[PDB]
Write a protein that binds this ligand. Structure first.
Ligand SMILES: [K+]
Ligand SMILES: [K+]
Ligand SMILES: [K+]
Ligand SMILES: [K+]
Ligand SMILES: [K+]
Ligand SMILES: [K+]
Ligand SMILES: [K+]
Ligand SMILES: [K+]
Ligand SMILES: [K+]
Ligand SMILES: [K+]
Ligand SMILES: [K+]
Ligand SMILES: [K+]
Ligand SMILES: [K+]
Ligand SMILES: [K+]
Ligand SMILES: [K+]
Ligand SMILES: [K+]
Ligand SMILES: [K+]
Ligand SMILES: [K+]
Ligand SMILES: [K+]
Ligand SMILES: [K+]
Ligand SMILES: [K+]
Ligand SMILES: [K+]
Ligand SMILES: [K+]
Ligand SMILES: [K+]
Ligand SMILES: [K+]
Ligand SMILES: [K+]
Ligand SMILES: [K+]
Ligand SMILES: [K+]
Ligand SMILES: [K+]
Ligand SMILES: [K+]
Ligand SMILES: [K+]
Ligand SMILES: [K+]
Ligand SMILES: [K+]
Ligand SMILES: [K+]
Ligand SMILES: [K+]
Ligand SMILES: [K+]
Ligand SMILES: [K+]
Ligand SMILES: [K+]
Ligand SMILES: [K+]
Ligand SMILES: [K+]
Ligand SMILES: [K+]
Ligand SMILES: [Mg+2]
Ligand SMILES: [Mg+2]
Ligand SMILES: [Mg+2]
Ligand SMILES: [Mg+2]
Ligand SMILES: [Mg+2]
Lengths: 181, 162, 79, 129, 82, 152
RNA sequence: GGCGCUGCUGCAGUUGAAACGCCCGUAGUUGGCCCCCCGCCGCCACGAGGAAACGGGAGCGCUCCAGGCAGGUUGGA
């Protein structure tokens, strides 16, 4: 890391995101409808009592492969052990793209992938599709029709082996087409 | 120096000096051979101003050694949809070769409207049709239009009359 | 006798349908008429089917007819 | 509706020559039709043509010299590997010595002899002989 | 010329005639085909012996009556008519 | 035309001039025919009739040749384009008329047949406009509600 | 296999067997012409990587042969 930190003079003020995260943590403590207190495993919970600010209050990482961390994950207040940026999982294996078929589950979506199958006797093709279940971190929000890029992780449920890592929005009320990519 | 945009690239000084319309100025005069040698460029958002009085303007120039055409300065863009990072920017349709080369042949003879084009496949050539009534006042200017069009587009061109 | 399709005779080309000509073109045209009581002159479409008035008159001076239109008591030209 | 402009052009040309006409008009025009007529011309099967502009889909006027036994298109445009060309040659062509199958490849439009001269494949669009 | 051997010799038995109008080959047993010849005067309104022009027409052009105009057009190209 | 919902096969149409230029007698500038277009649109004239009036009174063959744009685009540029395009509006009007005729005459099956044809055309065109972003994504033709939307 | 009597190449549907009584219409299939010199598919070519036997195929007289991998510096490409 050859270069070192150019000089803005509003940095320490702009770290008011510390009180932001702190009061979000203290709001989670008051929602007595919950049964478990949710917290990241990478973070002490004694760093919140301190005032010198010297220690970070939220954990995040980079996933590699030229995919950059969204700022909504860096400055969010949610808890997700299955989020690839702020949870306890990793991305490795195949990386694919598809379209959102359904977003009706809890932090889970269905993805529709399209492809062609050649039949040699008839010298022609047929159009085919498959459905893939994927995990949706709160740092993204999607609707049906949007393009997504998903990447492989370890097994996460009976049907899920992938995680949403990029979103390309698609306007509502547009003609739905084959769109293989 | 107030009649041209470029400065200091100076083949014909005298055109700017003679042209001194008080609000108008030109750029980038050119010389094309082939007899009586020959093209004057103008900034695009003044063509409609220049073409207003252009029949009686070209006379007051044809500097008897040369012949003068008034054309607009037009940009041709290479790619449609340049993909710069995360987005694609769309090439304006007026900036293609097919549009600009069609505008040049219309501005080459502006007071007169061509009434037909054909492409002959004999090296392909272009045949341009004009109304017969105005056969005079173009008859002596046709070889200049053909040579200049080949110089600016490299298309063979012949002229016939309605 | 030897006709060339690339340079048809205009006379026998005008008698064909406007669309199956070599280069499609309109059949209509404009023309000048003179008001029967006013010195001036107005330019009128040859296939009009909408009101056309005098500069002075309030009586409509055209009769729509399903083809070329006729006129009431006026004398015409071609430009 | 109208789908294959090249098919209609070639049917019109074959009809006109079978009658014994000197010229024929085909409309509309297109880039593909001009490429097909250019190849037919360069092999010597037709004379001059002319594309006439109408600020629409243009017309073409074709001059005929009585050398065209048949011309057609292959729909759909099946793709052909380099080694299947000959299994197509003995299918469409009257012999192995004259006639032409036209392919589109990433090196342009070309006949089959040049396609095996550059040892590549492509997609078939038509044939004449 | 006709078909050639691999060395350069024509291995063709005979060459059919071609139509002067439609360039089609005549072929044997096409008994509607006609060859005919025109005088080519050239000499003060009187013909010259054994100096003619000669055309041929296949049966397809005759079966529809196309020859009356095509023969005329062919003649106007050889300086025998106008 | 006359061929989507019948066995017509008619070809009657207009063919515009090859040359794209003002008229020899054209005095008008774009800024002064835009004036007449906007005065006619404010008065309540539909865009297909504005072209008729400019053709028949002002001796202008094509508005595009004298301005460089088209009539509906100029209306849109001065904020005077309609909420609903003219052709869809006319089809809805004809549907309302046929339904109101059928309210007194329940034995007219020919009119019911033509009502079906008109409404099928309406749905197809509405889908076109919707996916093209010329109409709200929630636009829907409703037979029962169509009479009072014509006022707005 | 004969069999183009299963037809992608490549059948038949007026009368031999066979065009729904007709109109609308979703899924599906198909869709004129135009900008070239960007991106993403398909497609074509060439590579990398993974099994032999079988199947092709270079060389070799189990006396020939079906074989086999021999052999007189070699070889199983
Ligand atoms: K988290
Ligand atoms: K695919
Ligand atoms: K497959
Ligand atoms: K399919
Ligand atoms: K689970
Ligand atoms: K599960
Ligand atoms: K599809
Ligand atoms: K006709
Ligand atoms: K007509
Ligand atoms: K008429
Ligand atoms: K129909
Ligand atoms: K009809
Ligand atoms: K018809
Ligand atoms: K009904
Ligand atoms: K109905
Ligand atoms: K419908
Ligand atoms: K309906
Ligand atoms: K539709
Ligand atoms: K519909
Ligand atoms: K309305
Ligand atoms: K069989
Ligand atoms: K078989
Ligand atoms: K067989
Ligand atoms: K059949
Ligand atoms: K039966
Ligand atoms: K039966
Ligand atoms: K029967
Ligand atoms: K049927
Ligand atoms: K059926
Ligand atoms: K039906
Ligand atoms: K239907
Ligand atoms: K339909
Ligand atoms: K459908
Ligand atoms: K579909
Ligand atoms: K199908
Ligand atoms: K499809
Ligand atoms: K279709
Ligand atoms: K491929
Ligand atoms: K290729
Ligand atoms: K092995
Ligand atoms: K060795
Ligand atoms: Mg007509
Ligand atoms: Mg239909
Ligand atoms: Mg029709
Ligand atoms: Mg008509
Ligand atoms: Mg069989």
């Amino acid at each position: 890391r050859h270069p070192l930190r150019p000089d803005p003079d509003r940095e320490r003020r702009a770290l008011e995101r510390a009180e932001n995260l702190r009061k979000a943590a203290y709001e989670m403590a008051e929602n007595q409808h919950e049964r478990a207190y949710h917290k990241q495993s990478q973070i002490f919970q004694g760093r919140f009592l301190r005032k010198d600010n010297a220690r970070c209050l939220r954990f995040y990482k980079s996933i590699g492969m030229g995919y950059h961390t969204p700022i909504t994950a860096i400055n969010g207040t949610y808890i997700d052990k299955k989020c690839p940026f702020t949870g306890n999982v990793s991305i490795r294996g195949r990386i694919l793209r598809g379209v959102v078929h359904s977003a009706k589950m809890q932090r889970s979506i269905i993805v529709r992938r399209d492809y062609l199958h050649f039949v040699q006797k008839y010298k022609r093709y047929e159009r085919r599709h498959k459905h893939v279940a994927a995990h949706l971190s709160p740092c993204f929000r999607v609707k049906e029709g949007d393009i997504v890029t998903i990447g492989e992780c370890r097994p996460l449920s009976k049907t899920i082996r992938f995680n949403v890592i990029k979103v390309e929005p698609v306007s509502e009320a547009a003609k739905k087409r084959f769109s293989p990519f | 120096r107030k009649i041209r945009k470029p400065f200091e690239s100076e083949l014909e000084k005298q055109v700017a000096g003679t042209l001194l319309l008080g609000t108008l100025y030109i750029s980038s005069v050119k010389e094309i051979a082939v007899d009586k040698k020959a093209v004057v460029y103008v900034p695009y958002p003044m063509l409609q101003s220049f073409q207003k009085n252009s029949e009686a303007l070209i006379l007051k120039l044809e500097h008897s050694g040369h012949r003068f055409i008034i054309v607009a300065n037009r940009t041709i863009m290479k790619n449609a949809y340049v993909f710069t990072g995360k987005k694609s920017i769309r090439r304006p349709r007026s900036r293609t070769m097919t549009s600009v080369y069609n505008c040049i042949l219309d501005d080459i003879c502006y007071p007169i409207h061509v009434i037909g084009k054909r492409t002959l496949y004999p090296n392909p050539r272009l045949q341009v049709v004009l109304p017969k009534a105005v056969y005079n006042e173009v008859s002596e200017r046709t070889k200049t239009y053909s040579a200049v069009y080949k110089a600016l587009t490299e298309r063979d061109t012949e002229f016939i009359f309605m | 006798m030897n006709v060339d399709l690339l340079y048809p005779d205009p006379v026998e080309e005008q008698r064909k349908h406007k669309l199956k000509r070599l280069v499609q073109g309109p059949n209509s045209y404009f023309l000048e008429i003179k008001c029967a009581g006013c010195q001036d002159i107005v330019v009128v479409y040859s296939h009009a089917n909408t009101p056309v008035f005098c500069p002075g008159c309030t009586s409509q001076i055209s009769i729509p007819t399903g083809g070329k239109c006729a006129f009431t008591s006026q004398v015409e030209r071609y430009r | 509706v109208r789908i294959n402009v090249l098919r209609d052009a070639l049917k019109s040309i074959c009809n006109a020559q079978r009658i014994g006409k000197k010229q024929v008009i085909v409309r509309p025009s297109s880039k593909v039709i001009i490429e097909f007529l250019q190849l037919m011309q360069k092999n010597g099967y037709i004379s001059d043509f002319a594309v006439v502009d109408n600020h629409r889909s243009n017309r073409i006027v074709v001059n005929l010299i009585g050398r065209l036994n048949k011309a057609g298109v292959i729909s759909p445009r099946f793709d052909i590997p380099a080694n299947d060309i000959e299994k197509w040659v003995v299918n469409l062509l009257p012999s192995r010595l004259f006639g032409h199958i036209i392919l589109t490849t990433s090196q342009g439009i070309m006949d089959h002899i040049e396609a095996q001269h550059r040892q590549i494949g492509g997609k078939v669009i038509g044939y004449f002989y | 010329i006709g078909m050639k051997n691999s060395s350069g010799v024509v291995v063709d038995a005979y060459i059919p005639r071609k139509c002067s109008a439609t360039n089609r080959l005549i072929g044997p047993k096409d008994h509607a085909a006609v060859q005919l010849s025109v005088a080519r005067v050239n000499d003060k309104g009187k013909m010259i012996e054994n100096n003619y022009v000669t055309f041929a027409f296949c049966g397809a052009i005759r079966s529809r009556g196309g020859v009356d105009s095509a023969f005329m057009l062919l003649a106007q190209e050889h300086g025998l008519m106008e | 035309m006359g061929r989507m919902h019948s066995k017509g096969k008619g070809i009657s149409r207009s063919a515009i001039p090859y040359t794209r230029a003002p008229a020899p007698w054209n005095k008008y500038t774009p800024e002064d025919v835009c004036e007449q277009i906007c005065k006619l649109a404010k008065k309540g004239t539909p865009p297909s009739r504005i072209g008729l009036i400019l053709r028949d009174q002002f001796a202008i063959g094509q508005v595009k040749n004298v301005t460089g744009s088209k009539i509906v685009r100029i209306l849109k540029a001065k904020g005077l384009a309609p909420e609903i395009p003219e052709d869809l509006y006319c089809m809805i009007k004809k549907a309302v008329a046929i339904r109101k005729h059928l309210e007194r005459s329940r034995r007219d099956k020919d009119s019911k047949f033509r009502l079906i044809l008109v409404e099928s055309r309406i749905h197809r065109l509405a889908r076109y406009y919707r996916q093209a972003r010329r109409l709200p994504p929630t636009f829907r033709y409703k037979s029962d509600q169509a009479a009072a939307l014509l006022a707005t």
